[PDB]
């Protein structure tokens, strides 16, 4: 009531874009990529299905790719804070919450329960992976599962089903050994089987590089948590982010439905270039995502070329950070106009 | 008590005398009451299917009411084999019948078979799974005096899925006089006593699902009939046990498969 009147005059507050950008994770420096990814993320898209037979998922989902030292795990711990339904687990297996569901015998209950896994436990909101590339063989297959179906099939004990799990989802990794490696692709970077990257939206390749004032200004605030510790407020964004997803449904018929395709194919041009990761028209429905979680984020209703610029900015930002570095730097002289 | 007339019992034998005959129509059973007098064989087998050919309406009786049923047979069979044979049928003291051919609805696996076929013939499908190891229960138990030079010889019978009190399973350890006794093994009379334990065929319960088992119960000329892993066929009667004496009953009456024939797979 006097939540949806003030949080009007937050959306009409005509800088509602970059306020929450930077509200998501106040106590972080720098990575304003990461955030503007993971608004997007909270957002989410919108599902759709032409009849009940072309299920494309409306989640937006972002993988976080670098060497340690760089808030990861410190921002899937902010989006487990602030998301609700927001579950968090680890591939290792020392989160209280597996990935594949199981059926056993509670210890706590001793009850002959049905564990679902994270993956279904975050049925309608978020699962927040950590250490992605050191998951194990069935938790590989069952985040296969869960990306590609939102459809975790059991069939173990006397159990036969093929219950759902429509959540998003936020991961980490780390490269093979520990520095990333701008000579290679992200796909030989991080160690993950390509079906499982193809399932995802966003790449943020959160590279580490000495540079003094980016140190100076992090190691200032780092000890600035520490005296400490001897826009708007979380509460807000909360309630801002729970009123969009509840009823904003923007739809995409104002949108410059020949633009875009002229621009994929000169990005198909310049990714026929070379023989490197290219583009398809699995990019095309991610930029349609973003374009309506954008649309959700000032709650339109209705697609503008702002929020599609937007789109364009973050898919295409990510998508030539994750090519290789030649590619990397030729198809950012190339499309820079974006 | 004894019964002196039964209309029920009196017809079941004498339809059952008059289809084990057979000499006069074909001599199927003539044939096969001959081969096991010849060798020494007392467990007769039965196509039900020509059980409802000649009289069907027994047949209907025989299924849905299987110890009455039975026992008429074995009695009618004990009768038969007396007429065409007399020292054979005195050394032999009870001639059991087993059953055979199509059981239409009766012809179940261990899923299907509900409570809805008790006191009944069912014809169950299925792997075996367990082989007791097999044992004799006494039946007829001959005892000695040492003092008195007597002997005597207590009975039992086939309890297994009627009332039964403890004055039937008593067994003699002391004389009229406080004499005590001493039992004589070899004159006594024993039957092996088997229990296996039928399952759902592996590849015909639907997927995923836990399989359903039912008890069997085996005698005489039964018990090294299947071992484990076998792919058996068990027509039999399908009956409740008692929980033994109760003050309190749940109502939870556990089941078994009393074998009156055991098959393997026909290849
Ligand atoms: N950009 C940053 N701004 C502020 N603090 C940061 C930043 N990057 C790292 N830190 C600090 O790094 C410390 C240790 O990092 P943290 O535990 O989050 O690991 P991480 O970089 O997410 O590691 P990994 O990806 O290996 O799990 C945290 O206290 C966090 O405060
Ligand atoms: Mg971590």
Redesign the interface.
């Known amino acids: 009531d006097e939540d949806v009147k003030m949080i009007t005059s937050l959306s009409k507050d005509q800088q509602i874009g970059e306020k929450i950008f930077a509200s998501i994770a106040p106590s972080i420096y720098g990575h304003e990529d990461i955030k503007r990814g993971l608004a997007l993320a909270l957002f989410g898209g919108e599902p759709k299905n032409p009849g009940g037979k072309h299920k494309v998922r409306g989640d937006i989902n972002v993988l976080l790719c670098g060497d340690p030292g760089t808030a990861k795990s410190q921002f899937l711990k902010y989006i487990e804070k602030v998301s609700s339904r927001a579950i968090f687990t680890t591939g290792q297996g020392a989160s209280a919450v597996g990935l594949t569901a199981y059926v056993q015998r509670h210890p706590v209950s001793r009850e002959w329960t049905l564990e679902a896994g994270a993956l279904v436990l975050a049925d309608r909101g978020v699962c927040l992976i950590d250490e992605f590339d050191k998951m194990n063989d069935q938790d590989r297959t069952s985040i296969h599962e869960a990306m590609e179906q939102q459809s975790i099939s059991i069939?173990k004990?006397?159990?036969?089903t093929s219950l759902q799990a429509r959540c998003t989802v936020i991961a980490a990794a780390n490269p093979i050994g520990g520095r990333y490696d701008p000579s290679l692709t992200f796909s030989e970077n991080v160690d993950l089987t390509e079906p499982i990257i193809s399932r995802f939206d966003i790449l943020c390749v959160v590279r580490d590089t000495v540079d003094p004032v980016q140190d100076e200004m992090l190691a200032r605030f780092v000890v600035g948590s520490h005296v400490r510790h001897h826009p708007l407020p979380q509460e807000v964004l909360k309630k801002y982010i729970i009123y969009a997803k509840e009823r904003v449904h923007p739809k995409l018929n104002q949108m410059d439905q020949d633009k875009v395709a002229k621009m994929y194919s000169d990005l198909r041009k310049e990714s026929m270039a070379t023989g490197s990761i290219p583009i398809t028209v699995r990019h095309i429905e991610s930029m349609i995502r973003m374009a309506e979680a954008h649309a959700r984020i000032h709650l339109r209703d209705y697609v503008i070329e702002d929020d599609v610029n937007m789109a364009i900015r973050v898919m295409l930002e990510s998508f030539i950070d994750t090519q290789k570095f030649s590619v990397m730097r030729s198809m950012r002289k190339t499309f820079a106009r974006y | 008590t004894v019964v002196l007339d039964d209309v029920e019992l009196r017809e079941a034998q004498r339809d059952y005398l008059d289809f084990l005959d057979d000499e006069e129509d074909q001599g199927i059973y003539q044939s096969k009451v001959r081969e096991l007098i010849s060798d020494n064989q007392y467990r007769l087998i039965v196509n039900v299917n020509d059980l409802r050919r000649k009289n069907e309406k027994r047949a209907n009786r025989l299924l849905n009411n299987a110890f009455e049923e039975l026992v008429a047979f074995q009695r009618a069979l004990k009768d038969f084999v007396a007429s065409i044979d007399a020292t054979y049928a005195k050394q032999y003291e009870e001639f059991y019948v087993g059953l055979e051919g199509s059981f239409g609805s009766k012809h179940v696996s261990p899923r299907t078979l509900t409570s809805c076929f008790l006191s009944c013939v069912v014809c169950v499908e299925g792997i075996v799974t367990k082989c007791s190891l097999v044992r004799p229960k006494v039946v007829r138990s001959v005892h000695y005096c040492p003092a008195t030079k007597k002997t005597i010889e207590r009975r039992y019978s086939d309890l297994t899925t009627l009332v039964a009190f403890p004055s039937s399973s008593v067994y003699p350890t002391k004389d009229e006089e406080n004499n005590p006794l001493e039992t004589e093994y070899g004159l006594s009379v024993y039957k092996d006593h088997q229990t296996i334990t039928i399952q759902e065929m592996p590849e015909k319960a639907p997927?995923?699902?836990?399989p359903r088992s039912v008890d069997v119960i085996l005698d005489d000329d039964l018990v090294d009939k299947a071992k484990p892993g076998d792919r058996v066929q068990v027509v039999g009667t399908y009956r409740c046990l008692p929980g033994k004496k109760g003050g309190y009953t749940s109502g939870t009456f556990r089941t078994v498969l009393i074998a009156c024939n055991v098959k393997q797979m026909s290849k």
């Open positions: 069939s004990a006397g159990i036969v | 997927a995923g699902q836990l």
